[PDB]
């Protein structure tokens, strides 16, 4: 039973993925989005990637499947591999560290203007140690913090 408060937040993600507002996420748009994220996925990956979110193999993604894909993860096993790439995917420094600055560097290219007072707070609001920066160890805390 997904609460509305959750179903809403998800909507925000879509508008971020489907810039065309067609109502379906395609590979051409997916790669383009990940291509600007500093990532360089292969053709076999992007195409095969959609499959993961495409259980019906229709060639596109909808709301029911868009949430299921994310929700499912919460209702199944997880691979620290995804937490590594995504995380290291932001630390272009390959150092594995995301400072309130670096985060603002990438999250900024997203195409949305964010405020420092917010980012600084978020990162500092999640940093169980409050070091103004997030470490790989902290990343687990969130998933290990009931």
Binds Ca ion by CB under 5 A, chosen from 9, 22, 78, 118:
22
| Minimal distance, residue 90 CB to Tb ion, in Å | 28
How many residues interact with Ca ion (rule CB under 5 A)?
Answer: 10
Binds Tb ion by CB under 5 A, chosen from 9, 20, 52, 58:
58
| Minimal distance, residue 86 CB to Ca ion, in Å | 15
Binds Tb ion by CB under 5 A, chosen from 29, 54, 91, 127:
54
Q: Are 39 and 107 in contact (CB under 8 A)?
A: no
Separation between Cα atoms, residue 35 and residue 94, nearest integer Å: 18
Dmax (CA) of the chain:
46
Give the SS3 label for residue 130: coil
Which pair of structure tokens corresponds to residue 76?
């199944």
Query: Binding of Ca ion at residue 131 (CB under 5 A)?
Result: yes
Query: Binding of Ca ion at residue 85 (CB under 5 A)?
Result: no
Separation between Cα atoms, residue 33 and residue 24, nearest integer Å: 14
How many residues interact with Tb ion (rule CB under 5 A)?
Answer: 4
Which pair of structure tokens corresponds to residue 108?
């900024």
| Minimal distance, residue 83 CB to Ca ion, in Å | 17
Binds Tb ion by CB under 5 A, chosen from 25, 31, 65, 139:
65
Nearer to Tb ion, 49 or 83 (CB): 49
**Total length of the chain:** 146
Give which of Ca ion, Tb ion, none residue 58 binds (C-beta under 5 to 8 Å, depending on kind).
Tb ion
Which pair of structure tokens corresponds to residue 38?
């500093």
Q: Are 127 and 134 in contact (CB under 8 A)?
A: yes
Q: Which residues bind Tb ion (CB under 5 A)?
A: 54, 56, 58, 65
């Amino acid at each position: 039973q997904l609460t509305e408060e959750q179903i809403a937040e998800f909507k925000e993600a879509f508008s971020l993925f489907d810039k065309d507002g067609d109502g379906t996420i395609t590979t051409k748009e997916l790669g383009t989005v990940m291509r600007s994220l500093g990532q360089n996925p292969t053709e076999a990956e992007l195409q095969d990637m959609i499959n993961e979110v495409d259980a019906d193999g229709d060639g596109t993604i909808d709301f029911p499947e868009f949430l299921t894909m994310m929700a499912r993860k919460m209702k199944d096993t997880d691979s620290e591999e995804e937490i590594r790439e995504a995380f290291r995917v932001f630390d272009k420094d390959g150092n594995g560290y995301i400072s309130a600055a670096e985060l603002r560097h990438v999250m900024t290219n997203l195409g949305e203007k964010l405020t420092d007072e917010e980012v600084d707070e978020m990162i500092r609001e999640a940093d169980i140690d409050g070091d103004g920066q997030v470490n790989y160890e902290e990343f687990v805390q969130m998933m290990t913090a009931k």
